Amino acid sequence: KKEVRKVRIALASPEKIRSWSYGEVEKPETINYRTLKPERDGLFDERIFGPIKDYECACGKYKRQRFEGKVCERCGVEVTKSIVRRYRMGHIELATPAAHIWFVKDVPSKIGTLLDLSATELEQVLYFSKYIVLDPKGAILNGVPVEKRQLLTDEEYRELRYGKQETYPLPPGVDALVKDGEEVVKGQELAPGVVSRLDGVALYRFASILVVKARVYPFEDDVEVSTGDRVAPGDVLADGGKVKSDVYGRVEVDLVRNVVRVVESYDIDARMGAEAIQQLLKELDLEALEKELLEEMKHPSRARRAKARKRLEVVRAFLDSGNRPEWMILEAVPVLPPDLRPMVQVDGGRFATSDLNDLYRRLINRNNRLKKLLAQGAPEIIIRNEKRMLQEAVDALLDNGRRGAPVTNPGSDRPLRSLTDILSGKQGRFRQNLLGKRVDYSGRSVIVVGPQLKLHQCGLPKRMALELFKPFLLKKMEEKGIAPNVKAARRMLERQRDIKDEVWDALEEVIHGKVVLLNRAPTLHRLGIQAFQPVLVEGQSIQLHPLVCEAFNADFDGDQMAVHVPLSSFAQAEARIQMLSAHNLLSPASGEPLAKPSRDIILGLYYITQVRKEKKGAGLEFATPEEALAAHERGEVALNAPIKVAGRETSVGRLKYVFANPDEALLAVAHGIVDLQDVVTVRYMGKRLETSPGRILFARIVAEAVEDEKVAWELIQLDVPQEKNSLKDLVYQAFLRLGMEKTARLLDALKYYGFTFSTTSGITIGIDDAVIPEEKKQYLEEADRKLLQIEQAYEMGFLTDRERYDQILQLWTETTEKVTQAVFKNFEENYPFNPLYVMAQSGARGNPQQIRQLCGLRGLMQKPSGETFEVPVRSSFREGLTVLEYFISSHGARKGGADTALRTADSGYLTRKLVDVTHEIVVREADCGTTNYISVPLFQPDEVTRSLRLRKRADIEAGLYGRVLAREVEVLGVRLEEGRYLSMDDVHLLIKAAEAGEIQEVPVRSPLTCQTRYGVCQKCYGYDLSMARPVSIGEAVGIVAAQSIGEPGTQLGLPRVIELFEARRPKAKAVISEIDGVVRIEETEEKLSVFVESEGFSKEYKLPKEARLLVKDGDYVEAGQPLTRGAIDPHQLLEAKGPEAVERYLVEEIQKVYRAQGVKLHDKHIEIVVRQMMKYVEVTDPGDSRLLEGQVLEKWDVEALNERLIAEGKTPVAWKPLLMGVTKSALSTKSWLSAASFQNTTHVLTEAAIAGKKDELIGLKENVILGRLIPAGTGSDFVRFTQVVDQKTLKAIEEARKEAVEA
Amino acid sequence: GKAQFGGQRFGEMEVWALEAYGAAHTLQEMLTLKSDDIEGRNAAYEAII
Amino acid sequence: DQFRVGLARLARGVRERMLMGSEDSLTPAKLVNSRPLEAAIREFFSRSQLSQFKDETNPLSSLRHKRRISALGPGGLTRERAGFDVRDVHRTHYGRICPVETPEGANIGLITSLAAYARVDELGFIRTPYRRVVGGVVTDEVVYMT
DNA sequence: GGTGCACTACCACAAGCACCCAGGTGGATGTGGAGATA
RNA sequence: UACCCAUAACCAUAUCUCCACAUCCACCU
DNA sequence: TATCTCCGGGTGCTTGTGGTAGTGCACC
Ligand SMILES: [Mg+2]
Ligand SMILES: [Zn+2]
Known part of the structure; x- marks a missing residue:
C-alpha cells in the first residue's frame, strides 16, 4: 500500500539467488514437437515456474471458489493465471564458481582494482587459462625470492609443487652402477652409457632410475615423520633429535634401505580460475586494506596516490554499502522466467525461440557435462578444458562479444542476443520502456x-x-x-x-x-x-x-x-x-509569436495595404496655389496628371475625393470608384488622414476583431505596408495589451480577411514576371573585361594560382551583389506590383538570393571539396542553363541532400545530450537569498582592434528581456526598482539610455547564480514563457531549455556548438595569458617569442608562422586575455580566470553561431545548461573524504556548512570548480536510473552495483521510467494538492469552526 | 499489424514535449493506463464502459 | 561468382567422397551431389541483398529499377553506415551516371542509375558515345569512350 | 664542501580499444541443415 | 457416554491467438 | 524411410613509455 520512494541496486548473494528461485533446472529440453506441453525440468517446466494453463490445475478437484484455497485433492496448485510464469524464477547450481563478466571486463576492472591484479592479461589468464595464484606460502626459492600473491605459470608451478623430478627407464636385468641413495652430479657416468643432468640423488630399481633434487638421510631407528607429511627445517624427521629437517619439503620413508628422502617442495596453494578468485575474495578484509590505502595515499606524491585513491574509492564503496565482495562472483546463476523468453510456434509446428533459451540450453549442457566428468574421473588437462568451456558458456550467457562472438548454429552467422544485449543498445529495454512505444x-x-x-x-x-x-x-x-x-x-x-x-x-x-x-x-x-x-x-x-x-x-x-x-x-x-x-501563441525560445500570419495571409494583407505611385509629368507644385486645385482637377480630367500622382504636397486623389466615415469610403470602393491601393482623404474618429481605403479597412478589421477601437488605433501603424515584421509586432502588442481571447480572435479575423483578399486580389506567377534587367548585361561585359585583364595578369606571371583564384572569386562575388542590387533597383523603379518582388518585400516567400537566381544569375557554385569553381554561372532560370552548368549545380544539390541526411542525425544526438543533462531542473523554489547577479554588457568590447560600440538590439533583447533586476537602477529620470521584471518597453528604454551614454552594464538575476538546490528560483529564472507574465512555480525549465537549444540545430557551424557544449580542446587553440603584466614582443624569425613580463617572473610563449596574434608590443595584459587569434580552451581559461569568466565566454560563443544563422534564441536556456554543465567541484584540502575526487558543488557547500558552523571542527574542504563536457556531467549523476538510461548501461550499472545506490526519485526521467507521477508540472508540491470546496459547504464548515469555539 | 493496425509510437521527443508543458497525469495515463498496466487498462475500460 | 563458390563447395565434397571411397566404378553417384551448388544458387537468388523485389507499379518504374546501379552489395564493399566521401558526384559521371536520379534518403548518392546513352562494354566500364571531329567537320562516326 | 654522473619521476606522443552514427509509418519476402543410423 | 453430551462435509468470477528478428524498397521531416 | 542426432572510420580516452630535469650520493 505504501508508495515507492527509492530504488536500491546491489549485488545478489548466492543465498539470495536460492531464495528468489523456486527449484532448479537440470534438463536442456525445452519442449518436444509432439508434446506441445512443457517437456521436462527444462527451461519451460510447469511446476518450476507455475502452471502454463489458464485457471485449472493438473487435475482440478479442489479448484472452485468455495474451496480454491483448500489444497487440491489430487493436486497442489493454488488458483492463478499464467502470470506466475512471467515472474517466478529459476536457478542453476554450477558445480564450479564463475565470475560476472562485467566485474572482470569493465574498463575499470572491479576485480582487477580490488585485488592487485592486472586487468588486461593477469585476470583473464588466471581466470581462463591454466595459471596459478597462491596466498599462503611462497617462501620456496626458484632463484626468485618469496611469493605472496605472485602469478606463476602452471609449468614451473607444477614443477615446484612436487620437487624437481626426473625419471629415466633402466634396462631390466642390468645392474646400473648407481645405487639407491647415490648423489649424482652432471656428467657422472651412471652406466657404460648413461649420464644424468643435475646435482641430486638417483634412486635405483632392480629397473628404473629416479633423479630428484632432494636430500637423502639414512637412519636406524623409529620414524617420526611418516610418508606424506611436508616438513620445515628443525622439525624432527626420524630417530628423534638425531635427524631433523633441513629445508621445506615433503618426507618419504623407504624402509628397504631404511632411509628418509626429503624433497624441496612445501605445501603451497594451487588454484585456477574463479574458485581462486573466490578464495582471494574470501580471505580479503576491507578495513585493513582501507587503512593501508589511507597511509599509502597521504604520504607520497600525486602520481601513486592517484591510483591509490582510484582503488580506495572502490574499497570504501564496498565497505560502506553493505554487500561484501565474496559474492562478487556468482555460484548459482539465475534463470529468467519462461514468458520473458517464450518459445512460440510460428507455422507448421516450427518454434521461434528467443536466443536466451539457446544460451540457457548450452549452459545446462556444459554444466551437466562437467558434473558427469568430475563424477567419473579426472584427466587433469581434460578437466581444465571443460572448466574453460563452462566458464566461456557462463560469460557468453551474461553477454556476447566481449570475448569472441558465440553465434547461432553455423549457417546463421548472427551473434546471439544476451542479457546485456537486451538492456543496452539503441533499442534495448531502457530505450523502449522509457518510451512507451505503443498506446491504445x-x-x-x-x-x-x-x-x-x-x-x-x-x-x-x-x-x-x-x-x-x-x-x-x-x-x-x-x-x-x-x-x-x-x-x-x-x-x-x-x-x-x-x-x-x-x-x-x-x-x-x-x-x-x-x-x-x-x-x-x-x-x-x-x-x-x-x-x-x-x-x-x-x-x-x-x-x-x-x-x-x-x-x-x-x-x-x-x-x-x-x-x-x-x-x-x-x-x-x-x-x-x-x-x-x-x-x-508565443515561443518558449523567445517572445516571438508562432501563431503569426503565414505566407498567404501576409501576401493578402500586403496587397491590401500598399500604396501605388506612377509618375508626375505636370508641375507638381501645389502647396502654394489655390487655383491649382481647379487647374489640376482639370488636368486629371485630361491625361495631364494621373489620379495617384506624385504631386508636391498632395496627390490629386486626396483633393478629388474626401470621405466622411470609413463606411462611406468602403461603400464607394464597392462601386469601383477607387481601388484599395489609392490614397485618399478620410475623416477618422478625430482626424483627417491621407490613407488608402485598404489601410482603413485593415484598421477597421483590427478594431472589429477586438472590442475597443481606440486601443486598436493606438496599437497599429497605418502609414506603411503590412510586412510580416509589422504583423508580428502587431500580434505581440495585442497579446501584451489584451490577453488570450482577443489575440486569438484577432488572429482568426486576420486569417479570414487575408485569405479573402488574397483570392480576390489575384497574384499569379508568369514567366514574364521574372524580368531580366538589361543593365546586368553590360555589367557582365565589364566583369568579363576585368577577367580578361586578370587573366593576362596571370599570363605575365605576376600572380600565383592561389592569387588568381582569390582575385577571380572576389571579382565574381562583388559583381553578383552589384547585379542583385541592380535587380531590386529595377523592381522598385518600374514594377512595384510584381509578384516576385511583392513576395520578397513581404515575408511571404523567397529571398534576394533566390530572386537573383530566378532573374539574374547564380554566379558562384560550390565544389565538392568545399571551395568554389573558377567559372561562374552566367544564365538564370528565366533563361536556359547549359548542360555543363546544370551538371555543375548538381554538386551543390547533392551536397545539400547529404548534409541534411547527416546533420539532422548529429543535431538529434546533440539534443538528446542536452535534454539528459538538463532534465533535473524544474522551478520548485522560494526566492533564493542570492545576493549575486550577472552584469550583462551593452557594448561590444572589440569590433575593431580597440573600439567600443553598442551591441545590436537583437542581442540586448535576447539577453535582457524577461530578466529580473539585480538592484535598483535609475538611468533617465526613471527609477527601475530592484526586483522588477524587464518587459520590452524597459529594454528599449535601456537601449535608448545607453545610446545617450549613461550606463554600459545591467545587473540582472540569472540561473548562473541561483542558490536553489535542484532547479532555479522564480526570480533567478525570469519572465519569458508562452505567456508574458512571470513563470509559474513548478514548470520544467530544463527540458524546454534543451528543446529550445536543439530545435534550430536541424535547420542550420554545428560542430562548433558540439565542441563548445562538450568541453573540448579546439585544434585552433588561441594562446592566452594567465598573469597580469606587460607584453614584450620579440620578432625572432624562428618562432615569435611573446613575453608576459611581471615584477618577479617572465612567461615566454612561442608563436609559429600561422600564429596570427592580435596584440601590440608594450600593451598591458591580464589573466585570461587571448594573446593570439583562435578558439580558447575553456579548461585553461577556467584555470586562469575563473568560473564566471568561462561561463560568460561559453554563453557568448554559443550565441555567436546561433546569431550567425539568424536564429533568435534567448540566453536563459544556455545559462541553464551551462550551470548544469559545471555543477561539479574537486576537493583539494581533505575534510572527511579523499581529495582528488569530484562531485556536486551543492553537496560540498552543504558539507562545508555542516563542518564549519553547524558542527564543531573548522576543517576547510577547499575545492576547485571543475568544468567538464556535457556528456560527463550527464553520466556522473547522483541518480543511476538516468545515467543507465542515457549512454552506457554496462559501466553505469556496474558502478551503481558496487555500492548500493539508493536512487532518489527526483528528476523527471526516473519518475517516467518507474511510471509514477512527474515531480514537475502538476506534480509540484506547491500545487500538487489544493483543497477545493464550494462557498455553501465553506459556510457550513466555517460555521462548524465558529461553533467549535464553544460557548 | 495484420489483425489490427497497432498503436502509434510515442517515442521520447513526444514525451519530452508532453512533460515540457505542465502535463503530469496525461503522461502518467499514456504510459501506464493506455499502454502497459494490464490491470490498469482492463479496469479503465470497464470503468469507462 | 555465386555459382563458382557453390562449385568449389561441391569440389571439396567430391574430394572427401573420393577420400573415403574404395573402388573406382562410382563416377556419377558416389562423387557428385547437387545439394551444395543448388542450395548456393537458390540462396543467392532468394536471400541476397541485390536480388530485390521488383517495382512493377508502372512500366517506367520497372525500367528504372532494372537499370539502377547500386554501390552497396554483398557487404565487404560498402555499407550504409559511413559513405559520406563517395556519395558526392565525380567529374567523370558526366555522360555515364545521371547526377539527378539518386533517391533521397539514407541511400543518397550510393544508389544511382546510368545515363540513357550509357553502355557497359564487357567489364563494368561505362562507355559514352562521342562523335569524331576531324578538322572542322563532324562525322557521323560514333565511338564509345571509357 | 661544491659539479660531473646517473637516476628517476613527469610530460608529449603513439598505439590499442570501447563506443558514436536521429524520430515514426506503411508494404513486401525470408527461417537448423548435412550425415548417420535405424 | 446414551436424552444434554457426538457434528463437519458438497457447487457459481474471463481481454486473448499470433505477430520475433533479419534483409530490401519506398514515404515525411 | 523416418526421425534423431553432430555441424570499421573517427574522437575521446586511457594507458604506457621513453624522455628530462630535480635531487640524492661520490670527486673537487
Ligand atoms: Mg511535408
Ligand atoms: Zn535564485
Whole structure:
C-alpha cells in the first residue's frame, strides 16, 4: 500500500539467488514437437515456474471458489493465471564458481582494482587459462625470492609443487652402477652409457632410475615423520633429535634401505580460475586494506596516490554499502522466467525461440557435462578444458562479444542476443520502456488545410473518431435505448452496415467538450504536441488550421499526423487549459509569436495595404496655389496628371475625393470608384488622414476583431505596408495589451480577411514576371573585361594560382551583389506590383538570393571539396542553363541532400545530450537569498582592434528581456526598482539610455547564480514563457531549455556548438595569458617569442608562422586575455580566470553561431545548461573524504556548512570548480536510473552495483521510467494538492469552526 | 499489424514535449493506463464502459 | 561468382567422397551431389541483398529499377553506415551516371542509375558515345569512350 | 664542501580499444541443415 | 457416554491467438 | 524411410613509455 520512494541496486548473494528461485533446472529440453506441453525440468517446466494453463490445475478437484484455497485433492496448485510464469524464477547450481563478466571486463576492472591484479592479461589468464595464484606460502626459492600473491605459470608451478623430478627407464636385468641413495652430479657416468643432468640423488630399481633434487638421510631407528607429511627445517624427521629437517619439503620413508628422502617442495596453494578468485575474495578484509590505502595515499606524491585513491574509492564503496565482495562472483546463476523468453510456434509446428533459451540450453549442457566428468574421473588437462568451456558458456550467457562472438548454429552467422544485449543498445529495454512505444487510443492520417476552422479546433474524420471514442460511444448510446447492453452495442458497431444516424448524434454528443492531442513525428520542441477541439467531418483526411503550419513543421505535401485521446477528466483539464493551441501563441525560445500570419495571409494583407505611385509629368507644385486645385482637377480630367500622382504636397486623389466615415469610403470602393491601393482623404474618429481605403479597412478589421477601437488605433501603424515584421509586432502588442481571447480572435479575423483578399486580389506567377534587367548585361561585359585583364595578369606571371583564384572569386562575388542590387533597383523603379518582388518585400516567400537566381544569375557554385569553381554561372532560370552548368549545380544539390541526411542525425544526438543533462531542473523554489547577479554588457568590447560600440538590439533583447533586476537602477529620470521584471518597453528604454551614454552594464538575476538546490528560483529564472507574465512555480525549465537549444540545430557551424557544449580542446587553440603584466614582443624569425613580463617572473610563449596574434608590443595584459587569434580552451581559461569568466565566454560563443544563422534564441536556456554543465567541484584540502575526487558543488557547500558552523571542527574542504563536457556531467549523476538510461548501461550499472545506490526519485526521467507521477508540472508540491470546496459547504464548515469555539 | 493496425509510437521527443508543458497525469495515463498496466487498462475500460 | 563458390563447395565434397571411397566404378553417384551448388544458387537468388523485389507499379518504374546501379552489395564493399566521401558526384559521371536520379534518403548518392546513352562494354566500364571531329567537320562516326 | 654522473619521476606522443552514427509509418519476402543410423 | 453430551462435509468470477528478428524498397521531416 | 542426432572510420580516452630535469650520493 505504501508508495515507492527509492530504488536500491546491489549485488545478489548466492543465498539470495536460492531464495528468489523456486527449484532448479537440470534438463536442456525445452519442449518436444509432439508434446506441445512443457517437456521436462527444462527451461519451460510447469511446476518450476507455475502452471502454463489458464485457471485449472493438473487435475482440478479442489479448484472452485468455495474451496480454491483448500489444497487440491489430487493436486497442489493454488488458483492463478499464467502470470506466475512471467515472474517466478529459476536457478542453476554450477558445480564450479564463475565470475560476472562485467566485474572482470569493465574498463575499470572491479576485480582487477580490488585485488592487485592486472586487468588486461593477469585476470583473464588466471581466470581462463591454466595459471596459478597462491596466498599462503611462497617462501620456496626458484632463484626468485618469496611469493605472496605472485602469478606463476602452471609449468614451473607444477614443477615446484612436487620437487624437481626426473625419471629415466633402466634396462631390466642390468645392474646400473648407481645405487639407491647415490648423489649424482652432471656428467657422472651412471652406466657404460648413461649420464644424468643435475646435482641430486638417483634412486635405483632392480629397473628404473629416479633423479630428484632432494636430500637423502639414512637412519636406524623409529620414524617420526611418516610418508606424506611436508616438513620445515628443525622439525624432527626420524630417530628423534638425531635427524631433523633441513629445508621445506615433503618426507618419504623407504624402509628397504631404511632411509628418509626429503624433497624441496612445501605445501603451497594451487588454484585456477574463479574458485581462486573466490578464495582471494574470501580471505580479503576491507578495513585493513582501507587503512593501508589511507597511509599509502597521504604520504607520497600525486602520481601513486592517484591510483591509490582510484582503488580506495572502490574499497570504501564496498565497505560502506553493505554487500561484501565474496559474492562478487556468482555460484548459482539465475534463470529468467519462461514468458520473458517464450518459445512460440510460428507455422507448421516450427518454434521461434528467443536466443536466451539457446544460451540457457548450452549452459545446462556444459554444466551437466562437467558434473558427469568430475563424477567419473579426472584427466587433469581434460578437466581444465571443460572448466574453460563452462566458464566461456557462463560469460557468453551474461553477454556476447566481449570475448569472441558465440553465434547461432553455423549457417546463421548472427551473434546471439544476451542479457546485456537486451538492456543496452539503441533499442534495448531502457530505450523502449522509457518510451512507451505503443498506446491504445491513437490514430494517424494525412493532414489537409482547414481554413474554415477557428484556431481552437481541428477536423477529425468521422470513422476514425468513431473508432477512437468507442467506449465513450458505447456508454453514451447505452444512456439511450439504441442498444440494450454493451455486447449488442459492440456488435452493432462491429460492422459499418449497421450504422445509424442516431449513432452519429451520440458521437457528436460525446465529444462536445472533449479535446484530442495532435502530434507530428519529429517533435523538435514543445509545440509538436497541441490539443484541439475535434469537429466531426465527412472525409478521410485530418483538417488542420493553417496558422499552426509553423508551430509544427507541417506543410501539406503529404506528411501525416497522429492523434491521441486523453481519458481522465483531470487530463482533459490539463490539455484544454495549458495545451490548447489558443493558449500557446508565443515561443518558449523567445517572445516571438508562432501563431503569426503565414505566407498567404501576409501576401493578402500586403496587397491590401500598399500604396501605388506612377509618375508626375505636370508641375507638381501645389502647396502654394489655390487655383491649382481647379487647374489640376482639370488636368486629371485630361491625361495631364494621373489620379495617384506624385504631386508636391498632395496627390490629386486626396483633393478629388474626401470621405466622411470609413463606411462611406468602403461603400464607394464597392462601386469601383477607387481601388484599395489609392490614397485618399478620410475623416477618422478625430482626424483627417491621407490613407488608402485598404489601410482603413485593415484598421477597421483590427478594431472589429477586438472590442475597443481606440486601443486598436493606438496599437497599429497605418502609414506603411503590412510586412510580416509589422504583423508580428502587431500580434505581440495585442497579446501584451489584451490577453488570450482577443489575440486569438484577432488572429482568426486576420486569417479570414487575408485569405479573402488574397483570392480576390489575384497574384499569379508568369514567366514574364521574372524580368531580366538589361543593365546586368553590360555589367557582365565589364566583369568579363576585368577577367580578361586578370587573366593576362596571370599570363605575365605576376600572380600565383592561389592569387588568381582569390582575385577571380572576389571579382565574381562583388559583381553578383552589384547585379542583385541592380535587380531590386529595377523592381522598385518600374514594377512595384510584381509578384516576385511583392513576395520578397513581404515575408511571404523567397529571398534576394533566390530572386537573383530566378532573374539574374547564380554566379558562384560550390565544389565538392568545399571551395568554389573558377567559372561562374552566367544564365538564370528565366533563361536556359547549359548542360555543363546544370551538371555543375548538381554538386551543390547533392551536397545539400547529404548534409541534411547527416546533420539532422548529429543535431538529434546533440539534443538528446542536452535534454539528459538538463532534465533535473524544474522551478520548485522560494526566492533564493542570492545576493549575486550577472552584469550583462551593452557594448561590444572589440569590433575593431580597440573600439567600443553598442551591441545590436537583437542581442540586448535576447539577453535582457524577461530578466529580473539585480538592484535598483535609475538611468533617465526613471527609477527601475530592484526586483522588477524587464518587459520590452524597459529594454528599449535601456537601449535608448545607453545610446545617450549613461550606463554600459545591467545587473540582472540569472540561473548562473541561483542558490536553489535542484532547479532555479522564480526570480533567478525570469519572465519569458508562452505567456508574458512571470513563470509559474513548478514548470520544467530544463527540458524546454534543451528543446529550445536543439530545435534550430536541424535547420542550420554545428560542430562548433558540439565542441563548445562538450568541453573540448579546439585544434585552433588561441594562446592566452594567465598573469597580469606587460607584453614584450620579440620578432625572432624562428618562432615569435611573446613575453608576459611581471615584477618577479617572465612567461615566454612561442608563436609559429600561422600564429596570427592580435596584440601590440608594450600593451598591458591580464589573466585570461587571448594573446593570439583562435578558439580558447575553456579548461585553461577556467584555470586562469575563473568560473564566471568561462561561463560568460561559453554563453557568448554559443550565441555567436546561433546569431550567425539568424536564429533568435534567448540566453536563459544556455545559462541553464551551462550551470548544469559545471555543477561539479574537486576537493583539494581533505575534510572527511579523499581529495582528488569530484562531485556536486551543492553537496560540498552543504558539507562545508555542516563542518564549519553547524558542527564543531573548522576543517576547510577547499575545492576547485571543475568544468567538464556535457556528456560527463550527464553520466556522473547522483541518480543511476538516468545515467543507465542515457549512454552506457554496462559501466553505469556496474558502478551503481558496487555500492548500493539508493536512487532518489527526483528528476523527471526516473519518475517516467518507474511510471509514477512527474515531480514537475502538476506534480509540484506547491500545487500538487489544493483543497477545493464550494462557498455553501465553506459556510457550513466555517460555521462548524465558529461553533467549535464553544460557548 | 495484420489483425489490427497497432498503436502509434510515442517515442521520447513526444514525451519530452508532453512533460515540457505542465502535463503530469496525461503522461502518467499514456504510459501506464493506455499502454502497459494490464490491470490498469482492463479496469479503465470497464470503468469507462 | 555465386555459382563458382557453390562449385568449389561441391569440389571439396567430391574430394572427401573420393577420400573415403574404395573402388573406382562410382563416377556419377558416389562423387557428385547437387545439394551444395543448388542450395548456393537458390540462396543467392532468394536471400541476397541485390536480388530485390521488383517495382512493377508502372512500366517506367520497372525500367528504372532494372537499370539502377547500386554501390552497396554483398557487404565487404560498402555499407550504409559511413559513405559520406563517395556519395558526392565525380567529374567523370558526366555522360555515364545521371547526377539527378539518386533517391533521397539514407541511400543518397550510393544508389544511382546510368545515363540513357550509357553502355557497359564487357567489364563494368561505362562507355559514352562521342562523335569524331576531324578538322572542322563532324562525322557521323560514333565511338564509345571509357 | 661544491659539479660531473646517473637516476628517476613527469610530460608529449603513439598505439590499442570501447563506443558514436536521429524520430515514426506503411508494404513486401525470408527461417537448423548435412550425415548417420535405424 | 446414551436424552444434554457426538457434528463437519458438497457447487457459481474471463481481454486473448499470433505477430520475433533479419534483409530490401519506398514515404515525411 | 523416418526421425534423431553432430555441424570499421573517427574522437575521446586511457594507458604506457621513453624522455628530462630535480635531487640524492661520490670527486673537487
Ligand atoms: Mg511535408
Ligand atoms: Zn535564485
